Write an enzyme that holds these catalytic residues in place. Structure first.
Site, PDB file in Angstrom:
ATOM      1  N   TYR A  16      85.168  35.741  51.783  1.00 51.72           N
ATOM      2  CA  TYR A  16      84.726  35.497  50.451  1.00 51.72           C
ATOM      3  C   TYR A  16      85.312  36.544  49.727  1.00 51.72           C
ATOM      4  CZ  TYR A  16      81.452  35.071  46.401  1.00 51.72           C
ATOM      5  OH  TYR A  16      80.915  34.868  45.080  1.00 51.72           O
ATOM      6  N   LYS A  30      71.567  38.082  51.376  1.00 52.19           N
ATOM      7  CA  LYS A  30      71.012  37.372  50.051  1.00 52.19           C
ATOM      8  C   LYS A  30      69.572  37.159  50.181  1.00 52.19           C
ATOM      9  CE  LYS A  30      73.418  34.456  47.859  1.00 52.19           C
ATOM     10  NZ  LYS A  30      73.943  33.577  46.989  1.00 52.19           N
TER      11      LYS A  30
END
Ligand SMILES: [Ca+2]
Length: 260
Positions: free
Chosen positions: A238, A119
């Site tokens: 996730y 990210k």
């Protein structure tokens, strides 16, 4: 010796229904800050195969932390981001992974589960306010169990990557196949997200997310390196749009450098 969940897939259990995202055990072996958004399980640890493993199990429909019908369940650890963009800045995670199970909808584009992701925010807008750059998405490969039942026997690891800063959805991201790993096989993992000098351009920088999976390199340059402000990594489990995902992490380490 096994630490696999084989019971019925349900969305919540008492023992996994944490009241806050920062619910953790004392002195976790896995590095980074817990972010538990699954009422199916909490972070726990096993002692098997000669190692200590953080256990990350999530199921479809188990996200009790985010607002309903928004983000997928997750249990991840976040790592302090490298908030610099000069050549030599990086975020570097390493660990040993076992994959036991991943989500499956029967359609590729919604199947598979992430065990780690890169990210990093960027200038100029585009995307969610804290947008992903790329994710490492494991898809199931089925085989017979020896008694006539198709079960998950191995996992195709793909990188889901932005086409441009902030990209999402069919137009905004692309899937690149990396490699297959067997169920329960111990896989050495490295992920380094950083900035390095661009050979083809004297004064310019490249923003990279370079992974090593079981000894093989999968390097990739992030689009529009000049808009990135940082490099960050998260790992765990996730996304689980059908069924259950089970990832195991041992011997994790994290370091970073910020170079202007
Ligand atoms: Ca939980």
């Amino acid at each position: 010796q096994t630490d696999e969940d084989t019971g019925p897939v349900v969305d919540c259990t008492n023992q996994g229904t944490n009241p806050t995202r920062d619910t953790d055990i004392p002195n976790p072996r896995n590095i980074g800050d817990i972010d538990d958004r699954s009422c199916y399980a909490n972070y726990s640890e096993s002692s098997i195969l000669g190692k200590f493993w953080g256990i990350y199990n999530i199921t479809d429909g188990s996200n009790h932390m985010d607002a309903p019908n928004t983000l997928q369940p997750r249990i991840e650890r976040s790592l302090s981001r490298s908030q610099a963009t000069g050549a030599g800045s990086y975020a570097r995670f390493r660990g040993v992974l076992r994959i036991l199970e991943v989500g499956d909808t029967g359609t590729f584009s919604s199947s598979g589960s992430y065990f780690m992701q890169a990210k990093g925010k960027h200038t100029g807008g585009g995307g969610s306010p804290d947008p992903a750059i790329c994710l490492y998405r494991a898809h199931p490969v089925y085989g017979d169990d020896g008694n006539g039942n198709q079960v998950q026997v191995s996992f195709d690891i793909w990188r889901e990557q932005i086409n441009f800063r902030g990209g999402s959805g069919s137009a905004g991201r692309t899937e690149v196949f990396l490699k297959n790993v067997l169920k329960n096989e111990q896989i050495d993992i490295e992920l380094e997200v950083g900035f390095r000098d661009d050979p083809n351009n004297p004064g310019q920088t490249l923003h990279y997310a370079d992974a090593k999976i079981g000894g093989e390199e999968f390097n990739w340059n992030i689009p529009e390196p000049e808009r990135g402000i940082e490099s960050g990594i998260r790992y765990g489990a996730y996304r689980v749009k059908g069924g259950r995902a089970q990832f195991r992490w041992a011997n994790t380490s994290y370091t970073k450098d910020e170079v202007n």
